[PDB]
Amino acid sequence: TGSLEESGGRLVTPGTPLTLTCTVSGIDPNSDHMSWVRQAPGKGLEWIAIIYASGTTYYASWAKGRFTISKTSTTVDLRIASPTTEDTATYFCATYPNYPTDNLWGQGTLVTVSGTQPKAPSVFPLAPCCSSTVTLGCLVKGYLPEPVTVTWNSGTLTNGVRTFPSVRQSSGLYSLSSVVSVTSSSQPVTCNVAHPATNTKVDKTVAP
Amino acid sequence: SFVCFEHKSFDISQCPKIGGHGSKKCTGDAAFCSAYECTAQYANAYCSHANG
Amino acid sequence: TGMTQTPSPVSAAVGGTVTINCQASQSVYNNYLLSWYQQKPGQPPKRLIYSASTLASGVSSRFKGSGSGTQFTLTISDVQCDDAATYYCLGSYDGNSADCLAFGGGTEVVVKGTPVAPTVLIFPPAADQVATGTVTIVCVANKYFPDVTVTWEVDGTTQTTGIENSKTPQNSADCTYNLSSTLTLTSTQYNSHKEYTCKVTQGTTSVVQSFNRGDC
Numbered sequence: 001t002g003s004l005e006e007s008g009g010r011l012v013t014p015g016t017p018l019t020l021t022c023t024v025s026g027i028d029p030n031s032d033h034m035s036w037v038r039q040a041p042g043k044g045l046e047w048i049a050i051i052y053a054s055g056t057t058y059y060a061s062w063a064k065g066r067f068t069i070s071k072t073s074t075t076v077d078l079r080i081a082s083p084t085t086e087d088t089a090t091y092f093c094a095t096y097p098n099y100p101t102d103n104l105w106g107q108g109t110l111v112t113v114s115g116t117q118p119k120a121p122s123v124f125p126l127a128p129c130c131s132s133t134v135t136l137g138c139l140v141k142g143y144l145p146e147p148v149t150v151t152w153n154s155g156t157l158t159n160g161v162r163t164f165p166s167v168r169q170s171s172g173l174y175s176l177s178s179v180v181s182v183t184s185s186s187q188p189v190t191c192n193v194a195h196p197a198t199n200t201k202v203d204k205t206v207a208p
Numbered sequence: 209s210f211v212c213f214e215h216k217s218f219d220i221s222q223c224p225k226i227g228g229h230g231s232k233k234c235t236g237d238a239a240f241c242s243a244y245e246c247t248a249q250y251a252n253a254y255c256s257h258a259n260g
Numbered sequence: 261t262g263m264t265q266t267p268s269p270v271s272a273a274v275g276g277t278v279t280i281n282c283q284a285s286q287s288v289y290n291n292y293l294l295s296w297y298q299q300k301p302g303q304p305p306k307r308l309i310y311s312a313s314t315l316a317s318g319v320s321s322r323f324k325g326s327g328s329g330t331q332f333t334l335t336i337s338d339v340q341c342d343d344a345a346t347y348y349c350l351g352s353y354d355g356n357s358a359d360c361l362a363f364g365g366g367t368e369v370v371v372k373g374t375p376v377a378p379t380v381l382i383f384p385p386a387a388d389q390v391a392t393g394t395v396t397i398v399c400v401a402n403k404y405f406p407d408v409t410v411t412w413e414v415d416g417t418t419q420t421t422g423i424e425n426s427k428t429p430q431n432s433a434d435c436t437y438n439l440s441s442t443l444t445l446t447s448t449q450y451n452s453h454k455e456y457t458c459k460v461t462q463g464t465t466s467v468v469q470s471f472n473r474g475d476c
Contacts, residue, residue, distance in 0.1 A: 031233075031249035033224075035361060044366040045297075045305060045348055053245050056227035058355035092304055097226075097295045097350055097361065098231050101250050102317060105304035126383035126398055130476040133440065135381055139398060139442075164426040164440040165301070175427065177398055177440045179381075229289040229352045231311050238310060 001106050002026040004093050009109030011118055011145040011197060014084050020109055022076040022093030027104075030054075033096040034076040036069060038089040039108075041168075048091075051076060085115040112145035116172045119144050120200040123193045126179065127208060134207040137179035138191035140170075149194045150178045157182075157189060210240055212255040220255065261285050263351055265364040272339040273372045274435070280367045282349035286358065293352035296325055296334045298345045299366075301429045308335065316439060338367070344371045344430035352441025353418040378404035380460050382469035385450070395450040399458030399469065401439040405415040405430075406462065411442040419443060 008020040022034065030053040038046050049059045049069040057069050068079040076093055090108040097103055119142060126137035140148055150163050160181035166174045180189055188207035194200070212218040212234070220258035224245045235241075235248040236255040244255070262285040272278040288294050292312040297305035307316045309325035312332060320440040322343075324335045336343055347362040378401035385395045401408055422445060428438040439460060450473070457470040 028249040031247040037363075045299070045346060045363045046359040047306075047350075047363060050355075050360050052224075052227055053247050054226050058227070058360040060359050094304075097307065098229060098293050098310055098352060099233055100231070100252070100310065100314070101233065101456075103295070103307040103310070105306075108304060122329060122392070124386040124389055124396070126386075128381065129384055129471045134400075135400075136399070137383065137400075139383075141396060162438050164428060164438070167424045167426050167442070169259070169424070173395075175424070175442070177400075177442070179400060179440075227355060229293050229354075231290075231293060 001096075002102065004095075004104050004106035005133060006091060006093055006106040006109035009091060009111045010031065011112040011114060012083060013115060013188040014113055015082050018080045018083055018111065020076075020078045020080070020091050020111070022026040024074055024076065027095075028071040032099070032101075034071065035094050035096075036067075036076075036078045036145060037094055038090045038111075039091040039092070040086075043089075046089075049078065050096075060205060061153075080111070083111070085113050086158075087111060088113050110146060114144070116144055118196050118197050119173060121148060121175075121193060121202070123191070123202040123204045125206040126177065126202055128208070131184070133183050134208050135179055135181045136142055136189055136208070137177055138193065138204055139175070139177050139208065140193050142173045143175075143195055144173050145197055148176070149181075149192075149196075150176075151192045152178070152180050153190055154192060209258050210236070210255040211258045212253050214253045215251070218253055223253065223255065261358065263349065263362050263364040264431045265347075265349060268346075268368040269370040270367060271370050271372055272336070272343070273376075274341065276339050277335060277337045278339055278345050278369060280334045280336075280369075282327075282334075282364050284330045284332075284351050287329040289352040289354060290308060291328045294325075294327070294332050295350045296332075296350065297348045298343075299348065300345050308347075315343075339369075339371055341371050341373055341430060341435040342432040343369055344432070344435065345369055351422065356378070358406065371430060371435050373405055375406065376404055376434075376436060377409055377462055377465065378402055378439075378460055378467060380458065380467045380469045382456070382458050382471055384456070384471050384473075390447045390450065393447050395445050395447055395457055397443040397445075397458075399441045399443070399460070401437075401441070401460045401467075403431075403434075403436045403438060405434075405436050407437070408439060408460045408462045410439070411458060411459045411461070412441070412443050413455075414453045415455050464469075 121143035224230035
């Protein structure tokens with residue numbers, strides 16, 4: 001019955017103040033102690049701050065003075081006063097970890113702090129050089145910020161799909177590939193690449 | 209001190225103090241809530257001021 | 261002030277038992293206010309244990325927590341492919357004197373299932389790539405365990421630059437990896453050489469895919 005949902009993550013330039021919001025559902029206004037936690041790409045979980053039911057707040061020693069935690073009857077907010085590139089991370093909200101009730105976490109909201117301007121990806125087909133079964137794909141290159149979404153045939157094609165984690169280039173842009181294994185009776189497969197940050201959608205059809 | 213009623217003597221140190229830590233959800237009367245967090249939803253225990 | 265976990269990776273054979281250690285420089289508040297978490301890629305962490313040893317609802321009895329004060333252990337028995345993940349302890353301390361809550365640095369579990377040699381595919385760049393100035397060749401290694409190393413060769417010369425690798429997380433049924441290795445060159449660089457080769461080695465044994473530029 002209870003759940004949490006973070007919002008407000010986006011790409012900003014360093015020093016741009018940013019407020020993130022945790023919307024609480026199915027949980028009473030003053031019956032839990034809510035924390036914000038972050039995780040930079042490839043790094044561990046870092047606790048940032050807590051707001052108790054009483055309204056009492058604490059911050060990690062590194063976080064004090066840079067972050068403000070607050071609450072309403074239905075939300076918990078985190079203000080990041082002066083972000084740096086080191087603040088790039090997924091930000092999660094979570095209930096109090098020592099209570100015997102279910103410890104709820106949201107899916108997280110992704111904050112990106114960078115000088116580099118947002119860029120839509122270029123999408124290129126992957127086909128073997130020109131069989132009963134074949135592997136085809138899409139190379140999604142040169143985007144910022146994460147994420148992109150990749151589906152095949154509008155989500156109807158899910159068997160034998162493999163999408164690789166993104167890699168950050170030296171440039172500061174991201175690239176990934178998705179591949180799918182299909183049979184000869186398959187009509188050419190279409191990868192649907194979407195980049196919410198630029199409100200961009202690319203459909204690329206791929207054939208042997 | 210306090211008298212504690214447990215839903216299934218009770219160890220009140222399991223109730224977080226205000227801005228404190230603990231393993232049980234506790235709620236209570238006005239005196240209890242002056243010193244302890246009061247979290248009524250799914251509470252494990254209710255604690256009230258002991259007269260006498 | 262310092263929470264140290266077992267260094268990564270911990271390698272556990274299927275059906276085996278693994279221990280992950282968490283050590284705190286100070287005792288946790290009330291000695292047992294320590295919780296454990298599992299995190300799989302792309303997901304928030306899931307609580308396994310609280311009060312040092314109490315199993316959270318929904319969680320398999322294969323997970324057990326023990327310890328008190330400064331020393332805690334998570335044990336995973338009958339280790340399955342699905343246990344491939346990063347595991348974290350979370351300590352509680354007086355917020356006036358220290359961090360209110362503190363995570364250990366995390367410990368990755370790699371599950372050793374049945375060995376399997378990779379198959380390799382190579383994908384020549386789409387024709388529309390070359391006009392952009394940058395060319396990107398993709399090599400893929402499918403459904404393999406244990407780890408592989410990738411080497412790229414152009415006309416027999418081993419490439420030392422412009423190579424990026426990305427590995428999927430261990431499959432939760434069979435423990436296998438998939439890898440994508442990408443070779444990025446300029447169009448003139450790409451148009452200088454004929455043969456593009458990707459060589460995937462697993463221990464002693466090697467699997468190769470090649471294509472000749474502008475040939476099919």
